[PDB]
Enzyme design. Structure first.
Site, PDB file in Angstrom:
ATOM      1  N   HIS A 182      44.766  33.834  29.955  1.00  0.00           N
ATOM      2  CA  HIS A 182      45.115  34.014  31.374  1.00  0.00           C
ATOM      3  C   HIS A 182      44.950  35.476  31.770  1.00  0.00           C
ATOM      4  O   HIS A 182      45.923  36.151  32.112  1.00  0.00           O
ATOM      5  CB  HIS A 182      46.545  33.515  31.672  1.00  0.00           C
TER       6      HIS A 182
ATOM      7  N   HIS B  59      43.357  38.336  34.229  1.00  0.00           N
ATOM      8  CA  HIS B  59      42.780  38.614  35.534  1.00  0.00           C
ATOM      9  C   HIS B  59      41.926  39.880  35.259  1.00  0.00           C
ATOM     10  O   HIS B  59      42.499  40.889  34.874  1.00  0.00           O
ATOM     11  CB  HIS B  59      43.890  38.841  36.588  1.00  0.00           C
TER      12      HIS B  59
ATOM     13  N   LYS C 108      38.361  27.857  37.184  1.00  0.00           N
ATOM     14  CA  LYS C 108      39.743  28.020  37.571  1.00  0.00           C
ATOM     15  C   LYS C 108      39.908  27.411  38.967  1.00  0.00           C
ATOM     16  O   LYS C 108      39.178  27.769  39.902  1.00  0.00           O
ATOM     17  CB  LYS C 108      40.166  29.488  37.547  1.00  0.00           C
TER      18      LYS C 108
ATOM     19  N   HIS D 171      42.444  27.225  41.823  1.00  0.00           N
ATOM     20  CA  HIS D 171      43.570  28.023  42.307  1.00  0.00           C
ATOM     21  C   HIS D 171      43.803  27.739  43.781  1.00  0.00           C
ATOM     22  O   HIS D 171      42.855  27.678  44.564  1.00  0.00           O
ATOM     23  CB  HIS D 171      43.295  29.500  42.090  1.00  0.00           C
TER      24      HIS D 171
ATOM     25  N   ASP E 124      44.789  29.409  46.233  1.00  0.00           N
ATOM     26  CA  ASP E 124      44.325  30.421  47.190  1.00  0.00           C
ATOM     27  C   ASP E 124      42.966  30.037  47.803  1.00  0.00           C
ATOM     28  O   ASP E 124      42.665  30.425  48.934  1.00  0.00           O
ATOM     29  CB  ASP E 124      44.345  31.835  46.580  1.00  0.00           C
TER      30      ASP E 124
ATOM     31  N   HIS F  85      46.151  26.343  38.854  1.00  0.00           N
ATOM     32  CA  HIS F  85      47.312  26.850  39.592  1.00  0.00           C
ATOM     33  C   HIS F  85      47.427  25.853  40.764  1.00  0.00           C
ATOM     34  O   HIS F  85      46.595  25.870  41.681  1.00  0.00           O
ATOM     35  CB  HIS F  85      47.086  28.279  40.082  1.00  0.00           C
TER      36      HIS F  85
ATOM     37  N   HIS G 179      51.050  28.978  33.977  1.00  0.00           N
ATOM     38  CA  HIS G 179      52.438  29.156  34.444  1.00  0.00           C
ATOM     39  C   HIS G 179      53.112  27.820  34.797  1.00  0.00           C
ATOM     40  O   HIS G 179      53.496  27.577  35.947  1.00  0.00           O
ATOM     41  CB  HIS G 179      52.528  30.192  35.591  1.00  0.00           C
TER      42      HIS G 179
ATOM     43  N   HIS H 298      51.728  38.355  46.258  1.00  0.00           N
ATOM     44  CA  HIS H 298      51.261  37.465  47.328  1.00  0.00           C
ATOM     45  C   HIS H 298      51.237  38.105  48.730  1.00  0.00           C
ATOM     46  O   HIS H 298      50.703  37.491  49.666  1.00  0.00           O
ATOM     47  CB  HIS H 298      52.051  36.137  47.327  1.00  0.00           C
TER      48      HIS H 298
ATOM     49  N   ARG I 112      67.613  29.128  43.902  1.00  0.00           N
ATOM     50  CA  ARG I 112      68.206  27.857  43.462  1.00  0.00           C
ATOM     51  C   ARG I 112      67.247  27.083  42.524  1.00  0.00           C
ATOM     52  O   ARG I 112      67.690  26.546  41.497  1.00  0.00           O
ATOM     53  CB  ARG I 112      68.618  27.000  44.679  1.00  0.00           C
TER      54      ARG I 112
ATOM     55  N   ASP J  93      48.916  36.513  32.505  1.00  0.00           N
ATOM     56  CA  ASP J  93      48.811  36.599  33.991  1.00  0.00           C
ATOM     57  C   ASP J  93      48.637  38.087  34.420  1.00  0.00           C
ATOM     58  O   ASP J  93      48.945  38.455  35.550  1.00  0.00           O
ATOM     59  CB  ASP J  93      49.985  35.916  34.736  1.00  0.00           C
TER      60      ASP J  93
HETATM   61 FE   LIG Z   1      48.328  31.641  39.066  1.00  0.00          FE
HETATM   62 FE   LIG Z   2      47.264  34.175  37.459  1.00  0.00          FE
END
Ligand SMILES: [Fe+3]
Ligand SMILES: [Fe+3]
Ligand SMILES: [Fe+3]
Ligand SMILES: [Fe+3]
Lengths: 564, 225, 225, 564
Positions: A135, A137, A218, A220, A222, A247, A273, A321, A333, A357
């Site tokens: 993982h 980046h 990947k 993801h 996004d 993801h 994750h 983010h 919570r 990550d």
């Molecule tokens: Fe991710």
């Molecule tokens: Fe990541």
């Protein structure tokens, strides 16, 4: 002759039945077997064993080792044993008893110590395989020294550099960007493999990327992790024998977790994750870990669960983010329930891998320490595993080491080349001093050469004087780095001469056998269960029993070893 | 200034020492890198003052940091420390053994299976032999050296040492001082007993067939008087 | 010491913090890098003392430097600060929002042409629609997602959402909590309305010709009950 | 479900603890371990296991076997166990449990049965490595079918054909003759290796031969086995990493046995017909077998010792050597003592190999039967070995199988390629029906293909109808024989492109690691002792104790199996 036990151990390291404390943790590794013949142990030095016509042969042999790691304590899924390790042609040639059959008893036939053999004293050291960080980046080339300094030799993931796409996702998108990065990779000592953009509802755009050299895709959120994207991506991956990493849809826009699982259709997929703080369907993404086809990993920030884990995240999520300060909570919570369960799920062998990550909600040089901190935390909370046989933690150790060595290798289709301390595999190994196990490595060997190590004053009369810090070695330099480093590609790219076509001088190897790896294929982490999340309390359940853990107030392999 | 790459390293070491000093003053128990840097900076300071010898410093720095001044296990983690520093007579290496006082905690601790001794070279037939170093200088002989081929200064019944080695731990040596007499324990060489090299008295299998030839070569070369 | 490249970075940051502290003591108004290093070193110090939580530090460091302790515009230039430090429970990220108190000076300030609102998606016909999240979990829907293809948990007249998207700022999402009812404003999708992907209910132009096929696929896949 | 023991054994063959009688001998092989999972055993046929999506995978895998030998009982120095054998790319890919991990438990990861897998039912069969006959006189090409029909896949030795030199010695002398024979070898299914004339007191003439492709040298008294010849030959062999075979000075012309041993100077040498009836220093050549550097073999006519052995020789010696009828005896007093001792020396592990001496005082298709007849004879006379653990002859079996499989391979420098049933080695295997073990093989596999087998009527509706006789299979024909057969050469010849230069289409592999193989290097036959012969009684002594055996009146694996 009768040698005092303390004197034997000082000279050659521990033998059968001895227990070694891993760093400052409460984990004890027991020597299961010793491959030596008492009195025939190899020792290097003046008047020692490895000398012309004595421990070193004068008889030419086809199996004359290029390097011998004498009296090593191997810690691997294959076992925790004492043996000499023999390297030849940048591969693990043999494991057993090395030396000269002309003058010694019990020498492993293909472990000849001769004129062309270099010596490395492993007596009293722990030898493990190089870690695989699945993982990454590819944000900064400065991650590589940090990774090597923490025992990581292979890095899978994606990027272009410090751009928003990479900052968020492990994606090197399209042909041009893939070619550029594979050519940039030439610089480094680290083994690499790049993932392309899996977020497509069109075949052509996905195929182009595999043919450009991608080791997988990947998916993801996004770029939109919709059911259409999930199906199209897996279809191409299945055709091209490449891995898919995911993801999931955090905001449940196109569906809930079960809708994503349905789209996958029992096909092999690597779930990043899995706990969900790093991203994914809120609040039930963790429920995927129970499924046989799901190959799940954890990212470093949530492992181990500490008294500062939740506080750190409720802001770390806002920097990564880029969220409004109007947003306070929901995560306050949801998060405790899943972060706590995650640690227990690791101990149960439900979560099979640990990843970083790196600079995108996770730490580059933390995969290895954090895995052992979690192992230690659980041992301290839940006690010794019932699975253990004897006064040792061998089973737990084997379960945890597999998370960052063999299991990522199996997932990404590189298990035949790297991942473990086994004959025939590439010599990507890490030498550790037991007092610093899991926190600070001594030597990093890649392709049979030392590439990185702890080194003192460059002027100094010996290699020990201060300041002792991590530095690049000969194997990381010149044209020797092309001999010690691998750029992994797809079979299609490999078979179509990507190496020649891109003028890559590094070792180019294809990823193979990604599509039919299930939970059953892993080592010591094959556990499947019915994982459920209460949508009101956010508590996690394994077959109806509450799955949890208490937060740590202090961790092992931390405060004693670091300045800052 | 013309700062050499080694001078740039020493600045970082010295600064780390200064940070460690500050933390100790705050009353914090120093960790492994802090403890090393704290002692290193002291050595670097004393060397610049050029009033103490290397010998003085090596002695002064034993238990420079006490067990309660550092975190548990720190002392055992750092059994020795080395720091090169410029003295008025040039750069010298200051080697300190036990710079930090140890405690009951040990990271990387080895717990033995049994306290019972290890029987090395088990089952091999021991040969007791009287040896005398008739030479003017002391000498040592390694565990795997073909005893028969040892320095001609050594006086012993060579015939009895043919195809044998010392029954001592692998890698150890036996010392025979100038004029000293000792009783050695010899065991037959392992494997095929294919003795190639050393003094070239044998260069082949140590069988009965090669023995007369080997004894004649030993006599001719002055090993057998 | 075994200093990692990340530890070497932190020494520079910490030294920069120490220089900044000295300059503040001299009564100098700190600049952008000095202010960041001054706050960073404080965080690094408190973390080593291991008596404060990340939560405590995040709160403590808001306006750690006051407007008169720094040069003008410095506060505005540093809206947030992040520093990773080792705590007794390991390395944790300390995130501070407004570490330096701002002043009315702003370097790189954007001055608006007008204060009047920007009419987004101008001239597009708005469709008011009642939506209910009948699911057990809350969900969000993006500005450019084909509304018709939203999570089957959402209960609304899907026929009316065919070929439409939310009339919200580009990049924003609309939240519909578990059990929550909302009135959404939908506008027709731009360009050719060639909807490919998402839930694959359409996979083509959103014309009248494709509508019946799309509604049947939506019903068959459980989007239309 | 509970399956009756008799029914299990009928369906899948024997399991752990079961004992198999080898042919009609009194030797019992015990299954040491079974690598299966009960209920998951592979069976081929209509409605059976190996079917699409069931026992046969539908999931593509990089380790899809080309052939699977289901439920085989392996008999090898490595062990006597039950396992599935997987062949891929003409090599033993894996040994364990084959099948489909998608539908089965306990499948060995690299043993995938798939669309491209052929099936061979080994249930109830014994699988052994192909035999190596290191004493071949290349006299007649008709020896090859006879050899294959007796489980022999590799033949080392020499010749030109039916000429006096060959008739007597295993020698292909000089460059031209070596080139001619290596090119003639192309015809056959048999793996070959040629020895040149070692009988030279000049370097050049020896060097020419190694460079011409010779795998070694034969020193034979017919060309004068003088001490000068012995030294010169071994010197060149040492330089070129090739083996030396010897037939010593029978008439003690240039010296006695000790003079020959002295000339050798502890250098590695293969001593043919060590007993001495086949030739060598009279009456003490057998005394060489006690020496560590001497790698000794036996020829078939003297093993086992029978009531007709002496009578047959006192005339067989006259036809081979072409002696006057005026010569009556010396051999009548010398021979019983050494022929008897020879059988016991085999049982003691003093004589490490068995060879043929084919059409030159020995039989081509008799190496394998005669080894087992000797094993049986000794068991019957001396009883079960003290070395045995349990109600079995496993140790004796392992000692005897090594004589014609692994030990000749070690001696000749081909142990890395062939010699045993081990992963990574070339798939040169023999399938046996237990009732015919050691006497009549079923199938001969060479390089993963069937090359020779017992076959019935060519017209017949099934392969079983009479007459069932040995015939050449597809692997022995066309260009497939070039893919399944090996011509072994020296490293010098190999490295200098002998293959291309002679236009050899066969697999050309170099012999390596010949010079440093001692008695210690063998498998189950590492025994060294002080062997003495009384020059008056001709009795043989092992460390002062009379070494002897009684002559057999009848042998196993003979009368029950053969027509003539
Ligand atoms: Fe991710
Ligand atoms: Fe990541
Ligand atoms: Fe002969
Ligand atoms: Fe012969």
């Amino acid at each position: 002759m009768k040698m005092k036990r303390q004197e034997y151990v000082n000279t050659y390291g521990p033998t059968t039945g001895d227990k070694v404390r891993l760093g400052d943790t409460d984990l004890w590794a027991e020597v299961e077997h010793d491959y030596t013949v008492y009195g025939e142990e190899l020792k290097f030095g003046a008047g020692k064993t490895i000398r012309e016509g004595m421990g070193q042969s004068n008889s030419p042999d086809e199996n004359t080792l290029d390097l011998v790691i004498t009296n090593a304590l191997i810690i691997d899924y294959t076992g925790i044993y004492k043996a000499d390790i023999g390297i030849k042609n940048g591969k693990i040639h043999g494991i057993g008893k090395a030396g000269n059959k002309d003058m010694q008893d019990g020498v492993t036939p293909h472990m000849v110590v001769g004129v062309g053999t270099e010596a490395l004293a492993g007596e009293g050291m722990i030898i493990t395989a190089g870690g695989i960080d699945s993982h990454t980046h590819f944000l900064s080339p400065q991650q590589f020294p940090t990774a090597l300094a923490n025992g990581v030799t292979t890095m899978f993931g994606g990027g272009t550099g410090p751009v928003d796409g990479t900052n968020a996702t492990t994606i090197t998108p399209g042909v041009w960007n893939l070619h550029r990065m594979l050519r940039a990779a030439e610089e480094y000592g680290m083994n690499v493999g790049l993932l392309g953009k899996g977020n497509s509802s069109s075949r052509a755009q996905l195929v182009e990327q595999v043919k450009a050299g991608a080791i997988g895709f990947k998916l993801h959120e996004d770029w939109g992790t919709t059911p259409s994207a999930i199906d199209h991506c897996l279809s191409v991956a299945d055709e091209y024998d490449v891995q898919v990493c995911i993801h999931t849809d955090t905001v449940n826009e196109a569906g809930y977790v079960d809708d994503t699982l349905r789209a996958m259709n029992g096909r092999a997929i690597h779930a990043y994750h899995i706990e969900g703080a790093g991203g994914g369907h809120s609040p039930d993404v963790i429920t995927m870990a129970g499924e046989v086809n799901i190959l799940p990993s954890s990212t470093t920030p949530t492992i181990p669960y500490t008294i500062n884990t939740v506080a750190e995240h409720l802001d770390m999520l806002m920097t990564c983010h880029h969220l409004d300060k109007r947003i306070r909570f929901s995560q306050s919570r949801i998060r405790p329930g899943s972060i706590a369960a995650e640690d227990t799920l690791h101990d149960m062998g439900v979560i099979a891998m640990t990843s970083s990550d790196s600079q995108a909600m996770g730490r580059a040089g933390e995969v290895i320490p954090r895995t052992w901190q979690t192992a230690d935390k659980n041992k301290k909370e839940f006690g010794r595993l019932t699975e253990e046989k004897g006064d040792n933690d061998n089973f737990r150790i084997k379960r945890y080491i597999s998370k960052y060595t063999i299991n990522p290798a199996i997932t990404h289709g590189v298990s035949e080349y790297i991942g473990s301390v086994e004959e025939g595999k590439i010599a990507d190994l890490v030498v550790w001093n037991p007092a610093f196990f899991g926190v600070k490595p001594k030597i990093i060997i890649k392709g049979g050469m030392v590439v990185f190590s702890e080194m003192g004053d460059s002027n100094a009369s010996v290699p020990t004087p201060q300041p002792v810090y991590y530095r690049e070695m000969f194997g990381h330099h010149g044209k020797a780095k092309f001999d010690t480093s691998i750029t992994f590609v797809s079979k299609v790219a490999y078979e179509n001469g990507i190496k020649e076509k891109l003028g890559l001088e590094r070792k180019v190897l294809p990823v193979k056998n990604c599509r039919n790896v299930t939970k059953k294929d892993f080592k010591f982490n094959n556990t499947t269960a019915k994982i459920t999340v209460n949508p009101e309390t956010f508590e996690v359940f394994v077959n109806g029993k509450l799955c949890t853990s208490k937060p740590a107030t202090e961790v092992a392999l931390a405060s004693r070893y670091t300045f800052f | 200034m013309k700062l050499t790459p080694k001078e740039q390293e020493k600045f970082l070491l010295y600064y780390a020492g200064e940070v460690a000093r500050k933390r100790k003053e705050e009353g914090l128990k120093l960790n492994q890198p802090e403890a090393i840097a704290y002692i290193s900076a002291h050595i670097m300071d004393e060397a610049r003052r050029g009033k103490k010898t290397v010998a003085q410093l090596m002695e002064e720095c034993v238990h420079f940091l006490k067990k309660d001044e550092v975190m548990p296990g720190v002392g055992n983690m750092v059994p020795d420390l080395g720091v090169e520093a410029n003295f008025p007579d040039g750069t010298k290496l200051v080697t300190v053994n036990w710079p930090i006082e140890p405690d009951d905690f040990k990271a990387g601790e080895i717990k033995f299976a049994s306290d019972k001794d290890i029987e090395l070279n088990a089952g091999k037939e021991i040969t007791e032999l009287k040896v005398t170093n008739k030479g003017p200088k002391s000498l040592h002989v390694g565990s795997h050296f073909h005893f028969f081929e040892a320095n001609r200064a050594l006086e012993f019944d060579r015939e009895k040492a043919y195809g044998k080695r010392l029954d001592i731990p692998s890698g150890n040596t036996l010392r025979i001082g100038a004029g000293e007499t000792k009783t050695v324990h010899l065991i037959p060489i392992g494997g095929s007993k294919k003795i190639i090299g050393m003094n070239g008295l044998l260069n082949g299998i140590a069988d009965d067939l090669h023995k007369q030839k080997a004894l004649e070569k030993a006599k001719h070369h002055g090993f057998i008087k």
